[PDB]
Amino acid sequence: ARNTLSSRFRRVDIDEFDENKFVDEQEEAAAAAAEPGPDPSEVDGLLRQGDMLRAFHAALRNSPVNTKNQAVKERAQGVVLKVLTNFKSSEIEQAVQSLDRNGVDLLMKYIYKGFEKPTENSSAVLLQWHEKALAVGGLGSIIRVLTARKTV
Amino acid sequence: MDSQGRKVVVCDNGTGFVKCGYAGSNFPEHIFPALVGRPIIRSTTKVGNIEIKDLMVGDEASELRSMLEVNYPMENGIVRNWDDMKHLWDYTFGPEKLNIDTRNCKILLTEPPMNPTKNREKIVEVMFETYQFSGVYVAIQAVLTLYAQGLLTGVVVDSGDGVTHICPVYEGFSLPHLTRRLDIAGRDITRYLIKLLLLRGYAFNHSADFETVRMIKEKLCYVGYNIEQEQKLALETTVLVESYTLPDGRIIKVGGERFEAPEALFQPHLINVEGVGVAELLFNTIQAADIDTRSEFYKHIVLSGGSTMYPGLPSRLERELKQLYLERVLKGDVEKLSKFKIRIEDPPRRKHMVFLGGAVLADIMKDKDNFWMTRQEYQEKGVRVLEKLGVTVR
Amino acid sequence: DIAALVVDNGSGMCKAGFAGDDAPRAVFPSIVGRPRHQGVMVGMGQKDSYVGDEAQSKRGILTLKYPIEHGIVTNWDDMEKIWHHTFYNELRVAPEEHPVLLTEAPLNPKANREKMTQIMFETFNTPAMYVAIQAVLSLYASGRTTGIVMDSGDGVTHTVPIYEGYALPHAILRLDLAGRDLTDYLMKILTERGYSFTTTAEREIVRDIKEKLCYVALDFEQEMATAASSSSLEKSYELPDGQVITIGNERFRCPEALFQPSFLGMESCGIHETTFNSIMKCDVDIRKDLYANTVLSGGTTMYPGIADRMQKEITALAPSTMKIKIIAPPERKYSVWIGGSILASLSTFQQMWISKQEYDESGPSIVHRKCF
Amino acid sequence: WXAXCPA
Amino acid sequence: WXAXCPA
Amino acid sequence: MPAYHSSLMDPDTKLIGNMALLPIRSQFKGPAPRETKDTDIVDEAIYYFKANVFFKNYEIKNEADRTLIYITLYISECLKKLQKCNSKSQGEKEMYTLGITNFPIPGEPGFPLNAIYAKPANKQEDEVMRAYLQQLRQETGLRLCEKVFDPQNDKPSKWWTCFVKRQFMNKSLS
Amino acid sequence: GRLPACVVDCGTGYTKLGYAGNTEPQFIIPSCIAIKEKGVDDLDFFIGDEAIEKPTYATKWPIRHGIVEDWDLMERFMEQVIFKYLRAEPEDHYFLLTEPPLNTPENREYTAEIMFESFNVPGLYIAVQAVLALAASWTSRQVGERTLTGTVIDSGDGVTHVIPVAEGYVIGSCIKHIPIAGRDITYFIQQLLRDREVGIPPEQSLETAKAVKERYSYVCPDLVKEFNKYDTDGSKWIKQYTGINAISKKEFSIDVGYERFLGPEIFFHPEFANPDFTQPISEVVDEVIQNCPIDVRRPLYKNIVLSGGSTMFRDFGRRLQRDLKRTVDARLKLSEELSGGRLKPKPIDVQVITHHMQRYAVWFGGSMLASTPEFYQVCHTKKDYEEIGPSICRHNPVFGV
Ligand SMILES: Nc1ncnc2c1ncn2[C@@H]1O[C@H](COP(=O)(O)OP(=O)(O)O)[C@@H](O)[C@H]1O
Ligand SMILES: Nc1ncnc2c1ncn2[C@@H]1O[C@H](COP(=O)(O)OP(=O)(O)O)[C@@H](O)[C@H]1O
Ligand SMILES: Nc1ncnc2c1ncn2[C@@H]1O[C@H](COP(=O)(O)OP(=O)(O)O)[C@@H](O)[C@H]1O
Ligand SMILES: [Mg+2]
Ligand SMILES: [Mg+2]
Ligand SMILES: [Mg+2]
Structure with a gap:
């Protein structure tokens, strides 16, 4: 059947103005000054001479995870994603094996971010990186990408 | 048990389930459906193991309903078939449940509000003549519901x-000019769930299959906090679709029939009922009350009965009330809603509160004589014994 | 014809007609029914809303809304349909030609008078108007x-x-405290016998019962014991489906609320x-x-x-x-309508009107000065 | 019920 | 009404 | 609507087990009292046979219904043997031999309605049951043979042997 | 010029085609489709009367209980209905279709998903079958004396x-839906004859059961009294039906007996066929009306319109009008007793009319409708489909929200 009374009260949503909503925490010390991240001149000067394996660690040493700002994160991603794309496919296992555990997890975070917005050939490389970091870090590396509340 | 050793019994005598027990009990002794079943022959069924009496009652009928033509004596609080209602009372007072002697016991009963008088007179006429109960009381549901919750002020649902x-109370002062009845409950839902399952091709026309759909309702059906969000889930996903296996082995599948059937408590036009739902009625009952009492009703909304046990009903009820408070009282001020104090007592023991309250009033008044109604009083006065309660009868 | 029009606009009924006449020409209930189902039979005069006696004929499939409650107008959109149904359909006159005399109870909110006078001019284009106490x-x-x-x-x-x-x-x-409060009280006590009336249409049936079988008792407590002893007051009523009921004590308990509002919970006298x-x-x-x-x-x-x-x-x-x-x-x-045809037929009254131009210069607030 | 509704 | 009674 | 039930039950009618030891008009011998009227529990069950085998739900109102259900189940045993007969004299000889057969009774296996039938408690009541049924099993068969056989050919009718596959609900005394 | 609308009442047995404005349909064909037993081979099919006779083709019946089950065939059944029989360019003509009340929404969605996307129609209205059958009766009724209020079977x-209609509005929440119809009557006669009358070839049992049903069958006042009339006086009640074999072309004859009244009896004793249903139709109608509002109970008893082909049985309304008047005159008697016997209430005037057009009643109410201009407002439109999607046709009056 049909009703013939004002039923407009059921349209407004009161749940928006709620006090029990979840609130995640952030690093107070980073809001004032953000981590500078891998400086381009550092990595780039190591890329000019072809020292990829050291420009590699220079990009994973600094990472603006604690930063609330998104541009420095984006600049940081473009730096490391610029680095991974220039590697030699035979040299990747040489580089991945050098990293400690906590660098493999940070690597796989950046890998699953490169798949978001790919260039012509940005993804055929990252799938090779994904194969090696998985051979070292296993599925538990990916789970620390899913559970990570703080993006790279 | 009173001072004289006479057991004090509390029988709810509901419309779908009987809740019988003794005073001071924190649970009920037996909870069984109020149906009577006579034997029947059907070609699909073949059983010759279990003896089937001529009159099966309660749990031994609903379990064997496949071989029976069950029939509910009570409908909408009113008693239709007395000869089938006495066969239920006997089972309730017999060796299968509460093997008591009626002549040496006190009984407490319940009637809903704004019911006819001949339904109350005829019960008391039966307890003193047929069973000859020593002391009788007919309480208000x-x-x-407040005694069990430990209260003196609260609008009941x-x-x-x-x-x-719906019956409001304020410090123990009845306000029967505010009592309201919606004509919808677990049986009007169980019919609507059959009318919906009929679209899928499942037919439950028989009297036994009515119980089978009740079990399908008690298990799966629920209430939607925001009915729009639930409709997206049924259109976009298929996770609401559950499965129920019937006694005959046939399996069925139930989806958006889970929140559409009990929505008829809030959108009652879906079952051809003109009016407003349990929320817009509870808000209008309060808005009829004296303006000073309204503040303490919102704080003490008390639920009860087994049709309030749909998952999501109190949350849905809190929501619809605050939408109406915002719309009609506050005229759209969201900022003032934070100060609106509302608490809906939804204890999970709300399935039996009319009984538990009867255990509480009995244990408090078991050993008093001005409270009950005696066999001697009914022999002398007759049905006019009810004037002790204030019910004007002649 | 330059005869003035008169409209009572009570809570339940709309009594209308011309000035100088002895009894009103049109009397119909002030209700506006909207259907409660979906009409799939097309080309069958299935309108979005019905008014007056056309609703009581179709009450079974409608929700009857009394736009007035305790004298106040709650729905002004529906009330335009009432007046529109009065002039064009019942009286069959344009309102811009004649004036109109309205009524209203005392101690009502001023916004109710402000809106009526606003509606007669801006909507119906009446030449003048007036608002009297009933x-x-x-x-x-x-x-x-x-x-x-x-x-x-x-x-x-x-x-x-x-x-x-x-x-x-x-x-x-x-x-x-009036008939609609008594009609509702009658539906509450009729449950005692076993008769349930909830629907709005069923509320109109009970109205017909109230105005056919309910009388006032000269001594309430005396007739209370009469019915308990005998069955003389037990009158019967035939519902449209053919069912039959019988009411005794409930015939004088309904209007006694006028003399004992405590039955309704009201503290008033x-x-x-x-x-x-x-x-x-x-x-x-x-x-x-x-x-x-x-x-x-x-x-x-x-x-x-x-x-x-x-x-x-x-x-x-x-x-x-x-x-x-x-x-x-x-x-x-x-x-109250008869006096209206009298009061509008007087020469002294022809100046108490509120003309179109007077409302144009002072706005709707002129009603408080002109109309007492 | 007797009149109105079944019960 | 707005306050007191409904209308 | 409901099927056709027995109208003959009266409180003066005796009970055997939970059945109705009702009067029967027969030359055979048994515990059944002799009837004077022109209608019995047998003539009814033969009137209502063709119609009651199509229904699928039967509500037991009284004990005479338990006597009607038995006959209506035994008539389906007569027709299985009668369709093979080429002469009424051959049928009356087959209807005798079948009634002598000791079918199951209320309480023992073989009986399809053991649940909704009450066995005999004492042995004397057992001996009365086995001799009441055998008085029905004989007058039923004797009265079918007047109906099944077309006198034009003196052979079974297709209007009765079409109900050979139609059990009462689906039950059988075998 | 301006073109009329196409009207299609796709039923279980027979399908009713044509264009609006006309009084009787241009075609009435069975709802069958003959297929062979990849590429262009899905177009080697025939429908209607051109499907029964085809020897090397397999005849399929895609509609059951009013609902479609194989939309792979009904999409082929509709592209001959349009391009072969009607010869309509669907991008120009609007369309009117019919559904039963208990048609699922997903079947309404796949319907519109077919017409709007595949056939690219500019409009579509899916109406309820029996409701259109009531508008037809009103034309037989006097002009101005049209009863808007009526019950429909x-x-x-x-x-x-069973569908009540009150003052033009459909009381959808009181509709009932009995699964018994002319296919259950036919399979019940097809059963009784297999038990008695062997000699009917299995390929011609169905043809033989319809013939018995349409010609010889009828409705009885009492069942068991008819069995005696067929036994005691058999020459008068037992008919004979000579058929023709289709292989040898030799005749076969049978005796038509108890299946004359036993088929139609399942309207009143439906547990003969379907054990999942016991209530007669005489009682389903009383619950439909007593569940309706108290004010429109009398006018609905007074206009009970029998429609459909399986109400053409002789003495169908005479028994239905009698089983009700028993049921209605008692209820008024009981109330007169409980009240006190002071008022004798007015009796109810039950009336069961059986109107002249039945094989094309629903189609006729669709042609009168489509010939109006109001049809072209309520019709869902191609534009509305692209925006809102195939859920535009999801709702029916039987339910709310
Ligand atoms: N889990 C559940 N969810 C929803 N409803 C339930 C559940 N369990 C029981 N019910 C309902 O509670 C009803 C019984 O309520 P109760 O008040 O105890 O009996 P009565 O209705 O006879 O007074 C039943 O009709 C049943 O449908
Ligand atoms: N014969 C009657 N007996 C009792 N009450 C009546 C009778 N006739 C009308 N009434 C009541 O009078 C009311 C209408 O009164 P009236 O002044 O004419 O219109 P309004 O109240 O709308 O101004 C109705 O609500 C009705 O219940
Ligand atoms: N004279 C008749 N008596 C009984 N049934 C008939 C008669 N004429 C036709 N029929 C039946 O009508 C049925 C079809 O009904 P109809 O509503 O026209 O089509 P559908 O059922 O497909 O909608 C057929 O099954 C046919 O046997
Ligand atoms: Mg209860
Ligand atoms: Mg007045
Ligand atoms: Mg049809």
Whole structure:
């Protein structure tokens, strides 16, 4: 059947103005000054001479995870994603094996971010990186990408 | 048990389930459906192992309903078939449940509000003549729902199988000019769930299959906080679709029939009922009250009965009330809603509060004589014994 | 035709007609029914809304909404359909040609008068208008200038004393207790016998029962024991489906609420004390003139026994010296309209109107100055 | 019920 | 009404 | 609507087990009292046979219904043997031999309605049951043979042997 | 010029085609489709009367209980209905279709998903079958004396429905839906004959059961009294039906007996066929009306319109009008007793009319409708489909929200 009374009260949503909503925490010390991240001149000067394996660690040493700002994160991603794309496919296992555990997890975070917005050939490389970091870090590396509340 | 050793019994005598027990009990002794079943022959069924009496009652009928033509004596709080209602009372007072002697016991009963008088007179006429109970009392379902909750002030919402009634109280002062009844309950839902399952091709026309759909309702059906969000889930996903296996082995599948059937408590036009739901009625009952009492009703909304046990009903009820408070009282001020104090007492023991309250009033008044109604009083006065309660009868 | 129009606009009914006439031309209930189902049969005059007697004919498939409640208008969109149904369909006249005389109960919110006058001009383009008190018109039809009127309708009940055309507003009293509050009370006590009426359509049936079988008891407690002993008052009523009911005690318990509102929970005093307490607020000099010229009005005063119970109770309060005489003409259900045709037919009244230009310069607030 | 509704 | 009674 | 039940039950009618030891008009010998009327529990069950085998729901109102259900189940045993007969004299000889056969009774296996039938408690009541049924099993068969056989050919009718596959609900005394 | 609308009442047994404005349909064909037993081979099919006779093709019946089950065939059944029989360019003509009340929404969605996307129609209205059957009766009724209020019983091949109509508005929440219809009557006669009358070839049992049903069958006042009339006096009640074999072309004859009244009896004793249903139709109608509002109970008893092909049985309304008047005159008697016997209430005037057009009643109410201009407002439109999607046609009056 049909009703013939004002039923407009059921349209407004009161749940928006709620006090029990979840609130995640952030690093107070980073809001004032953000981590500078891998400086381009550092990595780039190591890329000019072809020292990829050291420009590699220079990009994973600094990472603006604690930063609330998104541009420095984006600049940081473009730096490391610029680095991974220039590697030699035979040299990747040489580089991945050098990293400690906590660098493999940070690597796989950046890998699953490169798949978001790919260039012509940005993804055929990252799938090779994904194969090696998985051979070292296993599925538990990916789970620390899913559970990570703080993006790279 | 009173001072004289006479057991004090509390029988709810509901429309879909009987709740019988003794005073001071924190649970009920037996909870069984109020149906009577006579034997029947059907070609599909073949059984010759279990003896089938000529009159099966309660749990031994609903379990064997496949071989029976069950029939509910009570409908919407009113008693239709007395000869089938006495066969239920006997089972309730017999060796299968509460093997008591009626002549040496006290009984406490309940009637819903704004019911006919001949339904109350004829019960008391039966307890003193047929069973000859020593002491009788006929309580109000609302007042008992407060004793169990430990209160003196609260608007009650008691929804069962046939009746859905609302009774406000303020410091123990009844306000019967505010009592309201919606004509919707667990039986009007169980019919609507059959009319919906009929679209899928499942037919439950028989009298036994009515119980089978009740079990399908008690298990799966629920209430939607925001009915729009639930409709997206049924259109976009298929996770609401569950499965129920019937006694005959046939399996069925139930989806958006889970929140559409009990929505008829809030959108009652879906079952051809003109009016407003349990929320817009509870808000209008309060807005009829004296303006000073309204503040303490919102704080003490009390649910009861087994039709309030749909998952999501109190949350849905809190929501619809605050939408109406915002719209009609506050005129759209969201900022003032934070100060609106509302608490809906939804204890999970709300399935039996009319009984528990009867255990509480009995244990408090078991050993008093001005409270009960005696066999001697009924022999002398007759049905006019009810004037002790204030019920004007002649 | 330059005859003025008159419209009562009570809570339950709309009484309409022309000025100078003795009885109204159109009488229909003030309801607006909207359907509760989906009409799939096309080309069958299936309208979005029905009004008046066209709704009571189709009450089964409709939700009847009384736009007025206790004298106040709650839905102005529906009320335009009422007036539009009055002029164009019932009276079959344009409103811009003639003027109109409206009515209203005392102690209503000013926003109700402001809206009516706004609607007659901006919507209907009437040339002028006027707004009178309902009780005052009842005395014009009664042929008096001295007397206290007690108009009891469907939603409102109010007393108004006048003395030689001089109204005493300090003594006016209102009581939101009338037939619609009695109809609802009747539906609550009828459950005792086993008869359930919930639907709005079923509310109109119970109205027909109330105005056919309910009488007032000269002594409530005496007739209470009559019904308990015998079965003389047990009258019957035939529902449209063919069912049959029987009501005894419930015939005089319904209107007794007027004399004992505690049944309805209301703390107020009965009409028998209200009209008395109003008189006690008047001057000591003019009380005797009002004890004699005590008039009744409104459809709610059409119960049998209402005049005798008022005369009995009033005598018990007032002194034995004063003679209590109740006036209850057999057309008191239309007295307020009859006076309206009288008042608009007068030469003195032709200046009390509120013309189009006066509303244009002062706006709708002029009604408070012009219309008392 | 007796009149109105079944019960 | 707005306050007191419904209308 | 409901099927056709027995109208003959009266409180003066005796009870055997939870059945109705009702009067029967027969030359055979048994515990059944002799009837004077022109209608019995047998003539009824033969009137109502063709119609009651199509229904699928039967509500037991009284004990005479338990006597009607038995006959209505035994008539389906007569027709299985009668359709093979080429002469009425051959049928009366087959209807005798079948009634002598000791079918199951209330309480023992073989009986399809053991649940809704009450066995005999004492042995004397057992001996009365086995001799009441055998009085029905004989007058039923004797009365079918007047109906089944078309006198034009003196052979079974297709209007009765079409109900051979139609059990009462689906039950059988075998 | 301006073109009329196409009207299609796809039923279980027979399908009713044509264009609006006309009084009787341009085609009435069975709802069959003959297929062979990849590429262009899905177009080697025939429908209607051109499907029964085809020897090397397999005849399929895609509609059951009013609902479609194989939309792979009904999409082929509709592209001959349009391009072969009607010869309509669907991008120009609007369309009116019919559904039963208990048609699922997903079947309404796949319907519109077919017409709007595949056939690219500019409009579509999916109406309720039996409701259109009531508008037809009103034309037989006097002009101006049209009774807007009426009850409808539409029983065909698949399913039977009881639909009240009050003042033009459909009381959808009180509709009933009985699954017994002309296919259950036919399979019950097809059963009784297999038991008695062997000699009917299995390929011609169905043809033989319809013939018995349409010609010889009828409705009885009492069942068991008819068995005696067929036994005691057999020459008068037992008919004979000579058929023709299709292989040898030799005749076969049978005796038509108890299946004359036993088929139609399942309207009143439906547990003969379907054990999941016991209530007669005489009682389903009383619950439909007593569940309706108290004010429109009398006018609905007074206009009970039988429609459909499976109400053409002789003495169908005479028994239905009698089983009700028993049921209605008692209820008024009981109330007169409980009240006190002071008022003798007015009796109810039950009336069961059986109007002249039944094989094309529903189509006729669709042609009168489509010939109006109001049809072209309520019709869902191609534009509305692209925006809102195939859920535009999801709702029916039987339910709310
Ligand atoms: N888990 C559940 N969810 C929803 N409803 C339930 C559940 N369990 C029981 N019910 C309902 O509660 C009703 C019984 O309520 P109750 O008040 O105890 O009995 P009565 O209605 O006879 O007074 C039943 O009709 C049943 O449908
Ligand atoms: N004969 C009657 N007996 C009792 N009450 C009546 C009778 N006739 C009308 N009424 C009541 O009078 C009311 C209408 O009164 P009236 O003054 O004519 O219109 P309104 O109240 O809308 O101004 C109705 O609500 C109705 O219940
Ligand atoms: N004279 C008749 N008596 C009984 N049934 C008939 C008669 N004529 C036709 N029929 C039946 O009508 C049925 C079809 O009904 P109809 O509603 O026209 O089609 P559908 O059922 O497909 O909607 C067929 O099954 C046919 O046997
Ligand atoms: Mg309860
Ligand atoms: Mg008035
Ligand atoms: Mg059809």
